[PDB]
Amino acid sequence: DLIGKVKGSHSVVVLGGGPAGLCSAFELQKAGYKVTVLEARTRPGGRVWTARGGSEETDLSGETQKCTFSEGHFYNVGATRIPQSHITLDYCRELGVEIQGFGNQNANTFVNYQSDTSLSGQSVTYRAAKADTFGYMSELLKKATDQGALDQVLSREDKDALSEFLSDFGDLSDDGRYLGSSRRGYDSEPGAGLNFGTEKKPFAMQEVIRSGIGRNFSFDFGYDQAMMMFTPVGGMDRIYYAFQDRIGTDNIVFGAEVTSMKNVSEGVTVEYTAGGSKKSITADYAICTIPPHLVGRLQNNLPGDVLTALKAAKPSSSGKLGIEYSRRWWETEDRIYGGASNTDKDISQIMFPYDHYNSDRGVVVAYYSSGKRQEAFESLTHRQRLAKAIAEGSEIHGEKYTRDISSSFSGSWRRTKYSESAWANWAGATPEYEKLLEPVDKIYFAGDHLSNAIAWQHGALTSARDVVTHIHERVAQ
Amino acid sequence: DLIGKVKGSHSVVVLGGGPAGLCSAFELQKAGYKVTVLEARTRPGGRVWTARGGSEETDLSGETQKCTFSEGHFYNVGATRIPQSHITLDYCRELGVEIQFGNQNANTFVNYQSDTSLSGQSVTYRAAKADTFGYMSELLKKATDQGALDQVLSREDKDALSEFLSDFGDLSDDGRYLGSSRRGYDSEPGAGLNFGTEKKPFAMQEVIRSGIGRNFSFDFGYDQAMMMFTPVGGMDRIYYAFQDRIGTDNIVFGAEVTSMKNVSEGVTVEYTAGGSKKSITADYAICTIPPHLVGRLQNNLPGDVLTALKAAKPSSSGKLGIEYSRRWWETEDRIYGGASNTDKDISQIMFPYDHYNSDRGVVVAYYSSGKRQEAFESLTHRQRLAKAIAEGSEIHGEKYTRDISSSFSGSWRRTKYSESAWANWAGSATPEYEKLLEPVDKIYFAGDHLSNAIAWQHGALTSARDVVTHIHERVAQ
Ligand SMILES: Cc1cc2nc3c(=O)[nH]c(=O)nc-3n(C[C@H](O)[C@H](O)[C@H](O)COP(=O)(O)OP(=O)(O)OC[C@H]3O[C@@H](n4cnc5c(N)ncnc54)[C@H](O)[C@@H]3O)c2cc1C
Numbered sequence A: 001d002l003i004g005k006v007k008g009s010h011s012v013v014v015l016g017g018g019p020a021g022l023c024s025a026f027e028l029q030k031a032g033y034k035v036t037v038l039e040a041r042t043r044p045g046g047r048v049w050t051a052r053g054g055s056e057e058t059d060l061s062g063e064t065q066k067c068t069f070s071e072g073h074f075y076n077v078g079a080t081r082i083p084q085s086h087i088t089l090d091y092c093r094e095l096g097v098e099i100q101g102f103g104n105q106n107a108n109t110f111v112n113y114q115s116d117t118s119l120s121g122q123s124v125t126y127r128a129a130k131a132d133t134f135g136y137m138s139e140l141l142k143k144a145t146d147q148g149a150l151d152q153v154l155s156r157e158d159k160d161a162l163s164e165f166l167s168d169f170g171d172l173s174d175d176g177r178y179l180g181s182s183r184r185g186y187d188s189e190p191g192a193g194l195n196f197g198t199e200k201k202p203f204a205m206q207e208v209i210r211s212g213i214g215r216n217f218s219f220d221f222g223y224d225q226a227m228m229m230f231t232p233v234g235g236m237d238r239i240y241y242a243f244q245d246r247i248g249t250d251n252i253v254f255g256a257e258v259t260s261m262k263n264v265s266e267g268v269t270v271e272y273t274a275g276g277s278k279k280s281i282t283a284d285y286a287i288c289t290i291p292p293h294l295v296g297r298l299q300n301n302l303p304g305d306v307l308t309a310l311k312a313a314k315p316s317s318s319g320k321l322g323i324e325y326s327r328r329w330w331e332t333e334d335r336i337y338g339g340a341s342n343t344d345k346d347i348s349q350i351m352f353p354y355d356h357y358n359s360d361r362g363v364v365v366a367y368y369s370s371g372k373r374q375e376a377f378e379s380l381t382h383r384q385r386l387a388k389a390i391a392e393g394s395e396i397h398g399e400k401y402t403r404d405i406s407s408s409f410s411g412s413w414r415r416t417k418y419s420e421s422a423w424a425n426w427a428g429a430t431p432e433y434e435k436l437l438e439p440v441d442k443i444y445f446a447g448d449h450l451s452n453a454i455a456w457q458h459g460a461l462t463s464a465r466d467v468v469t470h471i472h473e474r475v476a477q
Numbered sequence B: 001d002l003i004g005k006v007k008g009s010h011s012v013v014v015l016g017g018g019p020a021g022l023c024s025a026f027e028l029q030k031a032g033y034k035v036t037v038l039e040a041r042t043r044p045g046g047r048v049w050t051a052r053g054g055s056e057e058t059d060l061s062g063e064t065q066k067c068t069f070s071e072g073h074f075y076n077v078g079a080t081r082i083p084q085s086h087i088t089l090d091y092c093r094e095l096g097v098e099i100q101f102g103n104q105n106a107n108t109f110v111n112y113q114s115d116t117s118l119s120g121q122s123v124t125y126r127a128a129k130a131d132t133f134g135y136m137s138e139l140l141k142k143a144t145d146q147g148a149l150d151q152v153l154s155r156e157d158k159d160a161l162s163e164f165l166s167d168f169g170d171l172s173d174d175g176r177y178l179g180s181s182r183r184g185y186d187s188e189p190g191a192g193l194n195f196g197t198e199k200k201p202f203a204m205q206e207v208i209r210s211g212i213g214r215n216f217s218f219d220f221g222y223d224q225a226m227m228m229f230t231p232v233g234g235m236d237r238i239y240y241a242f243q244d245r246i247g248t249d250n251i252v253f254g255a256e257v258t259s260m261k262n263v264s265e266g267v268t269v270e271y272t273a274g275g276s277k278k279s280i281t282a283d284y285a286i287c288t289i290p291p292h293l294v295g296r297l298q299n300n301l302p303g304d305v306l307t308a309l310k311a312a313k314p315s316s317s318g319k320l321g322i323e324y325s326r327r328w329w330e331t332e333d334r335i336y337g338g339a340s341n342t343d344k345d346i347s348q349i350m351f352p353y354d355h356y357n358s359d360r361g362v363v364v365a366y367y368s369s370g371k372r373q374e375a376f377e378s379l380t381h382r383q384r385l386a387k388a389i390a391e392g393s394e395i396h397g398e399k400y401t402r403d404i405s406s407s408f409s410g411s412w413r414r415t416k417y418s419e420s421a422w423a424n425w426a427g428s429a430t431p432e433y434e435k436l437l438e439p440v441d442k443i444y445f446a447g448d449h450l451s452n453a454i455a456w457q458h459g460a461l462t463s464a465r466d467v468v469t470h471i472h473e474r475v476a477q
């Protein structure tokens, strides 16, 4: 248990029913607090948003998209993957939300980059790119070792042990050269009898180095990205519908746009508009999970230095676009089941689905880009986003990328009402971050921006748990 | 698709209802042949065997094991994982067999003996990789900066390589490996000022001499690289699906073949079923019985064919599953699927890819081959279990010994109607392999041993398809 049972009558109003708000309400309710969550949207989960057939969104440009994905088909417009260390998985267990493997690494997906080489704009599988990169890297280090370049730092035994590893890791010849590998894959698959197949031949060392084909390999090592990774079966939002059901819809007001938040003699008073009607609620404490750039728009009595600190959390651009195909060509032709292709093009990456394997249709994430390469889509209409996504995807996966398209749906977080950012990028552990960990009398801030895991649910959930613990200790005092 | 309808009446007898035999029968039927499969066991699938509650097996030593795993819990005693290029996935699609396999995991352990302080110490894959690639990258950058590779790299190549090594190894600005977040954390980063605490790096010489990177290249195997897949509920679901499409009226289970002879009208096969000596004659035969077992049959095969069969030498491999009543690997070690790897006889410990976050699970406590399976072969199941738990506790601690519900083991060189895990051709195509691709009048051999994917279902399936195609083309003239 996070906290013991609270003694007596104590109330909290939670602004925002995203992960931080719902986790806060869930934990406070467990401990016997009166809790009310106010959520502006008509769904729980905030930046955890899963697009399905029937999903409708009007963005800040006034464009309305209606998703028409087939029944059971979806994609996560925000949060989609979870590493093994994150408390998100603990909450999936607590809430009974089934998880499955998320394909965050795949030998068969492509890399495709521009360079001053003949590989420029050429798709190469990860396994081929890795085999060549690690083949030549191993050959070079073995050559230096054999030449005696590392004799001041390696003993004879160290050199022998290193050489053995390099021959294995690089699949080197008996004489220490990278000459290609079955690890690159096959143009024709090995079968039965005298059907030996045909190994894909290697690129030259100079091509490999000058193409930068290994620029994305270290992504595999990210603490929060390395396999194994996980995701909820049927969409990430299922975590937050599960929180909703545990909290009870009697304790959550949806379509409740908070317009004011003030410390008052009785506690904290929050005004909000719901169903076009003006409402007010007072509680002993408030947990404010509204994104920090949006908090200043509220009528408030926050001190100037708090308002200034909130502005240090700069908004960030990020967006996704999903295309439903009526043929799973990536599985049938490319032998790609999940994972992502990676590119320097604006689309940045193409993410293949982790469910309905071998089915008749599926949703591909045609782009998931951030920063400059999302600013390239942000101001386009959805139709224009789609056209650009298809063109760039076809340059990676061929003309099949353009065929068998059923429908599509995009989100761009900086243009999305009640988000206006994918995640915070603090100016400059900063003084503004540290300032916003302190309560403003009876108002506490929580969210992924006030964590060391920004842009992870873990950050939101651990922030909620810390803030609930602080309120509980204060009530005890 | 494979073949397009046969004209008139034609019959085939298939010896063995493993993957090659069932695939053969399935495709022949689709083309309009009369087919009868003779299978010695009471289950379809052969070396594709899934142990669940109720499984009973008596091995060639006379020991009977009775599996008592909880409903819905199982493990694959033989085939368990499938790469994306294999036709096994295409048959899963055709048969409606749902797929979901963790073949790489940053959080599982490596544990090897060495003349270092890491000897017999468990190290996570992510820590072992970060240190290995960190120091490897530092050393290659050092050699490059020194000028050791000036005769093979240009100035611009050196700069491009240095950039890659900095990021691949997570080197400091001055080119040293000093640790990384990639190693993981002793305390997880959370919210506020809860930064967590990184795990500190091992020293260079220790890392090199420990051999903790000796298994990293497994990640790159053409048939092992992620993404990998497996059928939901067990690998044997593929072969129960074949069984149901073929029809149990066309399969005689508990049918021990004792004779196979070319005769005037085709091939006559004698077998014992229901205690009775039976005979069947068909136009053609497809013999999928493992090659070392074929010689035991009464037959009229030419001497050179009998000699060729003996060149396919049998091999030792086996597995042992333990059902735990607590998923400690998930709750304590944050391991969700994947395998720990070791030089101990157990060889590896494979964690389950289903029932994530649930209350119980089956761990494959060993999967070993060759000498390291010969260490288990002659042991009783009780002795196998004791050895598995002893060696496993040396890797995963005392928790490995607790919450044990039940267990079940297979050793393929002691298993009736297998007596081998897979073949190794002496001289490894070899002349004996080539010889056995030829029909012996109306008798065709098929199986994974007559493929370039031995010890894969793909090998058995492509062998079946090739043999069915040969028969069809011969029937067509
Ligand atoms: C593109 C993208 C990719 C991501 N990738 C991952 C990933 O793969 N895995 C992962 O774990 N996380 C990922 N995340 C991060 C994850 O979505 C966030 O960490 C999490 O949603 C943060 O929760 P929060 O409660 O702090 O904020 P939010 O989710 O933003 O919730 C804030 C809530 O406040 C509400 N609100 C705003 N204004 C008002 C108002 N005036 N009145 C009432 N309510 C209001 C909003 O509607 C919203 O529901 C991703 C996010 C994005 C957008």
Ligand SMILES: Cc1cc2nc3c(=O)[nH]c(=O)nc-3n(C[C@H](O)[C@H](O)[C@H](O)COP(=O)(O)OP(=O)(O)OC[C@H]3O[C@@H](n4cnc5c(N)ncnc54)[C@H](O)[C@@H]3O)c2cc1C
Binding pocket: B015, B016, B017, B018, B019, B020, B021, B038, B039, B040, B041, B044, B045, B046, B047, B048, B077, B078, B079, B080, B081, B082, B088, B255, B256, B257, B258, B288, B289, B290, B293, B317, B318, B412, B417, B418, B420, B421, B422, B446, B447, B448, B449, B454, B455, B456, B457, B458, B459, B460
């Ligand atoms: C330990 C182990 C691990 C494996 N790992 C993988 C993996 O992860 N993925 C993968 O794809 N493959 C794997 N395989 C390989 C896979 O199991 C085989 O490739 C496949 O089972 C071979 O099919 P087959 O039809 O050639 O032979 P078998 O499966 O051996 O079938 C032969 C059949 O002949 C029958 N038979 C024998 N004698 C008689 C007789 N006298 N009369 C009647 N019938 C008889 C047997 O009962 C059996 O059903 C593994 C196998 C083992 C044992």
